[PDB]
């Protein structure tokens, strides 16, 4: 009790996306945009598709470093492009200054930056399964009201720095409420955003020799 | 019918009729029948 | 009109053809007027 | 003996046209033939009535729609037939395709008033395992005990009102678990009849 | 569940020998064989008992007679037999002949304790149409529902008392409407039993 | 300032579907062009709405029909136009043909939602003289005084209910008595608009 509660079942902030600010070699960009997708890894998607409707707010945390695990004093900007705003296109973009895009300036040689994001959706709850069509075959069953906005990251810098910076985005689902429990997935996940499966059905249980064999 | 024969002894008639059906098959026999009634305006429905 | 809603289901060794009997009548609100001769 | 989906009678949204018993009548759909090798059938809830009668008119001419339902299955088998059906109502039934051609055809996502026969009854055509479909509201049709099953399902959606044609709320599924076996000399195809009756229906935005 | 002919229990004529339960017992007549093609049977009421037992004695030796009756039909079919009988009681059943030899033979106007099989069940052997015979007191014997039918018929005649042999009060008719059909391998002839019991009987004028 | 046809507000027949404000709305028909030489126009009352909107549906799909009406004429002339119209409502307007080919064509007995222009305004196309048409409920449209005229006409028929398509209750007639004259340089065709709104409507016998 209180240990299998639905709140405790989704706690314990875990990795959701490993994005990499490329700035060296053949990728002299210096920025990268990572669209927020809770259903990133399968181990998380299967837990989320347990319920149909879900309402929560997240607490993102960024664990960044260089590739040799050092953390020099480089200065980073993390900008949260809200759902419905334009996303930047290069290192120097007018979008990097729109005061309606919240931004967090934190050096590498600092504790990880942490920011909460509220429940951002027009509906009453996020909806993993949408039996319907928007725009009243590659459009079926895809709800647009689950978008949580983007996260753009750039080094506050003039030219290229020649240092790749790996970033690890961690997320903590707070205040979880869920509705309409569903059967847990049984087949492999063939494709993102679609429940398609393989022609070769795999039994849910492992097959023994006889019905009278233990 | 009795009413069918008596009404031929009169000119005008107006009222509400009832029609009772009765199934006379084996007890073990089951099924389902749909009885519809179309008012005098329309024509006979062509499909169930 | 009388429509076959479903099929006709019977256990084995049972006739597969029945009869429906229709009985007509008139409710209490029936009335007549202007008696006349008949046409047999 | 009627199952109450999640235990909530359907209710009007407190404050839009509220229709009457002229619309809230019993629509009796066609009867499908439960044969031996048959795999099952499913209907999308609001989609099954979008082209029949006054409810079809209201759905195809208004903009917002919300209604409960009193789906009702019955099957008329003899006492020598044997079998067992599972009828459940699945909210947000998202049919998925089966790649070895990556998304389901519209005839499979909105079958209409005629229903669609399952292609993969084991995995419910949606990857989830049938052995767990009982987590939804359901009733067992076991021929030796009962031959009817009524599910009252209220309105489950994120928004208060939604389009009656673009987004189908839930899906009624009926699958034979124990196949239909019968000795020689019986009606080789039990009939299954599905009666629907909307409840506490509402529309808004005519024409 | 017993029909009361015109809704009047039989009553003694207020003021003649009034017999007792020695006479007012249940006479069980012979059982006739309801076959497929059989057309029906009829009995004249007082005539059916004029040669059996103490009632036959009282009728054949007194002069005036009046009595009610509690005719009772029962048929013992199986649950796989199908059919439907119409049993009614017809006051003043005047059998008529069928010219292409102009009056019915006595064996057809007073058949006796053995009954007579109808020659024209459609027209009741009396010109009147069977489809209207229900205007008389009747009960339906439908094998899927019931297998018995009791009619209590009081004394209906113009005079207070009448001869028990010259003028028969009424006639018990039993006709199969829906014929008897049965699959192979059953008792090919359902038996029909007719039990009679006089009620509030009276006689006068012995020897 | 609204004339009450024979002084009786329309009333429901005391005891059949009673529609609502969804049907009891203001249907604004097309506007006809009152020119100089124009002779007038007439509409059959129930016939003018048998093909427009929900009222047209109810009429063309039920069997019995009864309803009042609140016919309303208005004409938007300038202050320099001159003329005078007579608008009256004629129960049982039986249009008659004009032999020198003996009965009126259907396009003249039921003109539709577009109205028909009179062929003989003097004799009302029915032999009766216009000078007496004022015996019916009427209102004068004299451009120097008023430019609107409302007639509330209840249900006048022999039977309680009647067919909405076979028998038209009454006919709205509007005739120019004093012709329309205007000096050079004005809108050469005054527009006349006819707004109808059913009242206390009823139907019975759907489908």
Automatic annotation (TrEMBL), chain A:
Q: Which GO terms describe its cellular component?
A: host cell; virion component
GO annotation terms (biological process)? symbiont entry into host cell; virion attachment to host cell
- Which cellular compartments is it found in? Host cytoplasm; Virion
Q: Where is the signal peptide?
A: none
| Positions of the Picornavirus capsid VP1 domain | 1-183
The alphabetized UniProt keywords are: Capsid protein, Host cytoplasm, Host-virus interaction, Lipoprotein, Myristate, T=pseudo3 icosahedral capsid protein, Viral attachment to host cell, Virion, Virus entry into host cell
**Annotated protein name in UniProt:** Genome polyprotein
State the organism of origin: Coxsackievirus A6
Section covered of the full-length record = 71 to 291 of 305
TrEMBL record, chain C:
Question: Localized where?
Answer: Host cytoplasmic vesicle membrane; Host nucleus; Virion
Residues annotated as coiled-coil are none
Quaternary structure, from the entry: Interacts with RNA-directed RNA polymerase.
What does this gene product do? Cysteine protease that cleaves viral polyprotein and specific host proteins. It is responsible for the autocatalytic cleavage between the P1 and P2 regions, which is the first cleavage occurring in the polyprotein. Also cleaves the host translation initiation factor EIF4G1, in order to shut down the capped cellular mRNA translation. Inhibits the host nucleus-cytoplasm protein and RNA trafficking by cleaving host members of the nuclear pores. Counteracts stress granule formation probably by antagonizing its assembly or promoting its dissassembly.
What family is it from? Belongs to the picornaviruses polyprotein family.
Know the name of this protein? Genome polyprotein
What species is given as this protein's source? Coxsackievirus A6
From TrEMBL, chains D, E, F:
The domain of life for this entry's organism is Viruses
Q: Where in the cell is it found?
A: Host cytoplasmic vesicle membrane; Host nucleus; Virion
Q: Relate the protein's function as given in its record.
A: Localizes the viral replication complex to the surface of membranous vesicles. It inhibits host cell endoplasmic reticulum-to-Golgi apparatus transport and causes the disassembly of the Golgi complex, possibly through GBF1 interaction. This would result in depletion of MHC, trail receptors and IFN receptors at the host cell surface. Plays an essential role in viral RNA replication by recruiting ACBD3 and PI4KB at the viral replication sites, thereby allowing the formation of the rearranged membranous structures where viral replication takes place.
Q: Give the record's family classification.
A: Belongs to the picornaviruses polyprotein family.
| Assembly and binders | Homodimer. Interacts with host GBF1. Interacts (via GOLD domain) with host ACBD3 (via GOLD domain); this interaction allows the formation of a viral protein 3A/ACBD3 heterotetramer with a 2:2 stoichiometry, which will stimulate the recruitment of host PI4KB in order to synthesize PI4P at the viral RNA replication sites. Homohexamer; forms a hexameric ring structure with 6-fold symmetry characteristic of AAA+ ATPases. Interacts (via N-terminus) with host RTN3 (via reticulon domain); this interaction is important for viral replication. Interacts with capsid protein VP3; this interaction may be important for virion morphogenesis.
Q: What is this protein called?
A: Genome polyprotein
Q: Which residues of the full protein are shown?
A: 99 to 320 of 2201
């Amino acid at each position: 009790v209180n240990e299998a509660s639905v709140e405790h079942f989704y706690s314990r902030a875990g990795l959701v996306g490993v994005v990499e600010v490329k700035d060296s070699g053949t990728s002299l960009d210096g920025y990268t945009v990572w669209p927020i997708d809770v259903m990133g890894f399968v181990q998380q998607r299967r837990k989320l598709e347990l319920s149909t409707y879900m309402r929560f707010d997240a607490e993102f945390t960024f664990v960044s470093n260089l590739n040799n695990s050092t953390t020099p004093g480089m200065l980073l900007q993390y900008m949260y492009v809200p759902p419905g705003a334009p996303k930047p296109d290069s290192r120097k973009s007018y979008q990097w200054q729109t005061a309606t895009n919240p931004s967090v300036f934190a050096k590498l040689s600092d504790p990880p930056p942490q920011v909460s994001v509220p429940f951002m959706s027009p509906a009453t709850a996020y909806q993993w399964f949408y039996d319907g069509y928007p725009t009243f075959n590659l459009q079926y069953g895809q709800c647009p009201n689950n978008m949580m906005g983007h996260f753009a990251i750039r080094t506050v810098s003039e030219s290229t720095t020649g240092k790749n910076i790996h970033v690890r985005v961690y997320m903590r689902i707070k205040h979880v409420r869920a509705w309409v429990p569903r059967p847990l997935r049984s087949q492999a996940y063939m494709v993102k955003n679609y429940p398609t499966y393989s022609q070769t059905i795999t039994n849910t249980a492992t097959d023994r020799a006889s019905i009278t064999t233990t | 019918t009795m009413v069918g024969q008596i009404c031929r002894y009169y000119t005008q008639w107006s009222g509400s009729l009832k029609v009772t059906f009765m199934f006379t098959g084996s007890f073990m026999a089951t099924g389902k029948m749909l009885i519809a009634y179309t008012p005098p305006g329309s024509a006979q429905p062509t499909t169930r | 009109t009388i429509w076959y809603q479903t099929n006709f289901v019977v256990p084995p060794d049972t006739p597969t053809e029945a009869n429906i009997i229709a009985l007509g009548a008139a409710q209490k609100n029936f009335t007549l007027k202007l008696c006349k001769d008949t046409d047999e | 003996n009627i199952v109450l989906s999640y235990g909530e009678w359907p209710e009007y949204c407190p404050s839009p046209t509220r229709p009457d018993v002229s619309v809230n009548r019993f629509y009796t759909l066609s009867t499908k033939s439960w044969k031996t090798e048959s795999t099952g059938w499913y209907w999308k809830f609001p989609d099954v009535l979008n082209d029949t009668g006054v409810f079809g008119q209201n759905a195809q001419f208004h903009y917002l729609y919300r209604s409960g339902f009193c789906m009702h299955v019955q099957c008329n088998a003899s006492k020598f037939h044997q079998g067992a059906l599972l009828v459940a109502a699945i909210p947000e039934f998202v049919i998925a395709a089966s790649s070895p051609g990556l998304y389901p055809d519209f005839a499979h996502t909105n079958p209409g008033k005629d229903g669609q026969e399952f292609r993969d009854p084991y995995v419910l055509d949606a990857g989830i395992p049938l052995s767990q479909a009982l987590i939804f509201p359901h009733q067992w049709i076991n021929l030796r005990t009962n031959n009817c099953a009524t599910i009252i399902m209220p309105y489950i959606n994120a928004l208060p009102f939604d389009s009656a044609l673009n987004h189908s709320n839930f899906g009624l599924v009926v699958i034979p678990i124990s196949p239909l076996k019968y000795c020689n000399g019986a009606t080789t195809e039990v009939p299954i009849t599905l009666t629907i009756a909307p409840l506490n229906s509402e529309f808004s935005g005519l024409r």
